[PDB]
Design a protein around this ligand. Structure first.
Ligand SMILES: CC(=O)NCCCCn1c2c(c3ccccc31)C(=O)NCC2
Length: 127
């Protein structure tokens, strides 16, 4: 029923790159999803305490959220686009794994994931 530490957003000994696909992931993908009317449940780690979800971190062992992803992008945590794409997919999958099918939160994730897929379909070829 307690919150775990959040996912890592800083690690000096992880090698890093700043690149055109990662720049698109920030400027196009993350920013598109972040501004959406259904983004708010996804903008920070799940607070299982305040939200009264004592089983959340029993079920979800790979937490991920857009606040973490935004920090990772802005703070140059990633080596490649696939790492970031994986974080988005983990976020969506967690939502579908935890929640009751058909609930509002699932519909919210689906709306964001539709846009995610639309944007990553046009991920640029690397420079
Ligand atoms: C991103 C994520 O999966 N968070 C965990 C659930 C957070 C609490 N919560 C819920 C619903 C919901 C809807 C909107 C915000 C928070 C919500 C809803 O539809 N079913 C009940 C749970």
């Amino acid at each position: 029923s307690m919150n775990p530490p959040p996912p890592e957003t800083s690690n000096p000994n992880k090698p890093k790159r700043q690149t055109n696909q990662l720049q698109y992931l920030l400027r196009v993908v993350l920013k598109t999803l972040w501004k959406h009317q259904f983004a708010w449940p996804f903008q920070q780690p799940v607070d299982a305490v305040k939200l009264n979800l004592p089983d959340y971190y029993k079920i979800i062992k790979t937490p991920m959220d857009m606040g973490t992803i935004k920090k990772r992008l802005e703070n140059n945590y990633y080596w490649n686009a696939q790492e970031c794409i994986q974080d988005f997919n983990t976020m969506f999958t967690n939502c579908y794994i935890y929640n009751k099918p058909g609930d509002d939160i699932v519909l919210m994730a689906e709306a964001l994931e539709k846009l995610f897929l639309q944007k990553i379909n046009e991920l640029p070829t690397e420079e």
